[PDB]
Amino acid sequence: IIGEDKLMVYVKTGIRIHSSINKILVGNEAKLRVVGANGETPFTYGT
């Protein structure tokens, strides 16, 4: 053996909306996303 290392895999529920803003001016936009209800980001479920 020349090394050992340890990935923690969590397997976990449902969905929520996410945005860093919830106000918009007339004529402005905001990009919304889904995130999981534990915290599951589109990086790991979005595929």
Place this chain on the structure above:
Amino acid sequence: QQFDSTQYQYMNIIPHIDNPNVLSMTQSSDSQVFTLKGLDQGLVTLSVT
């Protein structure tokens, strides 16, 4: 480990809010403490740098 309140006078503290029209903020007479106030019905996202 937390810093002691007496060291926060050395820090550049910057609060961040999305909707200040629903929830307002001021800093208090302690640099470590801020006073929030609700102004109208809604929901607001908050952080501090």
Place this chain on the structure above:
Amino acid sequence: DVSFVSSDPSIVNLSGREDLVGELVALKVGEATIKAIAQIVDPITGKKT
């Protein structure tokens, strides 16, 4: 969440499965309580409160 619970589903039932809908159906002559419960999910621990 808002979720609903009948004291006798055989006098008054909910038109669901997972019973978030608040729609109900009267099945017999009788008297019943429907308890509604409002609950927040903690987004950091998953705890319902």
